[PDB]
């Protein structure tokens, strides 16, 4: 399979034609995506197979071939970039200053950007190109627009 580091589209042939259900990140031999994209199903990569290794529905994350590797964090002050990979469209970087989701368990960065559902799992990066989280789990605010959490896992 293609093991090269980078951003990848997650496709399915179960529905009409080939549909893009999400996006993920390959890093240090592990594929990182959101749980709601694959539900933990096995993934095909050329002639090779990717099997889930860790997953958690509450964090909405899943890693394949190994443990979660992404551990960078938003510094709470700087602008970031969403490396959006929309269905049938080329990868595009979009710069934004994250907002905040305030919860009873602490604060999490949030990105107010609206993209098709099949863009879920696109990485959010800092100025050093480090993945600080994935786009795709959030809320619809008072006017209909979408706001995503910057969802990051834990490197054990």
């Amino acid at each position: 399979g293609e093991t090269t580091d980078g951003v990848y589209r997650v496709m399915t042939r179960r529905l009409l034609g080939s549909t893009q259900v999400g996006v993920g990140v390959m890093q240090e031999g592990v594929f990182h995506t959101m749980w709601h994209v694959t539900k933990g199903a096995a993934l095909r990569s050329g002639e090779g197979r990717l099997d889930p290794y860790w997953g958690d529905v509450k964090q909405d994350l899943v890693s394949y071939c190994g443990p979660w590797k992404l551990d960078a964090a938003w510094d709470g002050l700087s602008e970031v970039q969403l490396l959006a990979v929309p269905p049938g469209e080329r990868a595009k970087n979009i710069q934004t200053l994250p907002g905040i989701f305030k919860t009873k368990d602490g604060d999490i960065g949030a990105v107010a950007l609206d993209y098709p559902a099949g863009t879920s799992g696109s990485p959010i990066l800092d100025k050093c190109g480090r993945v600080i989280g994935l786009y795709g789990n959030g809320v619809v605010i008072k006017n209909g627009s979408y706001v995503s959490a910057i969802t990051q896992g834990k490197r054990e």
Binding site: D5, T12, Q27, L83, V85, I100, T103, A112, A149
Partner: protein, 39 residues
């Protein structure tokens, strides 16, 4: 049956389109991993 296709490198791009606001929202996270607004 799901499959992956490479879409690009992960790199910061100088002079990318700058957009989106920074809302501060009170949210709740349920056991199913769904976020909701708190008022």
């Amino acid at each position: 049956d799901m499959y992956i296709e490479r879409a690009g490198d992960i790199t910061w791009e100088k002079d990318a389109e700058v957009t989106g606001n920074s809302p501060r929202l009170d949210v709740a996270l349920d056991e199913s991993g769904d976020f909701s607004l708190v008022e």
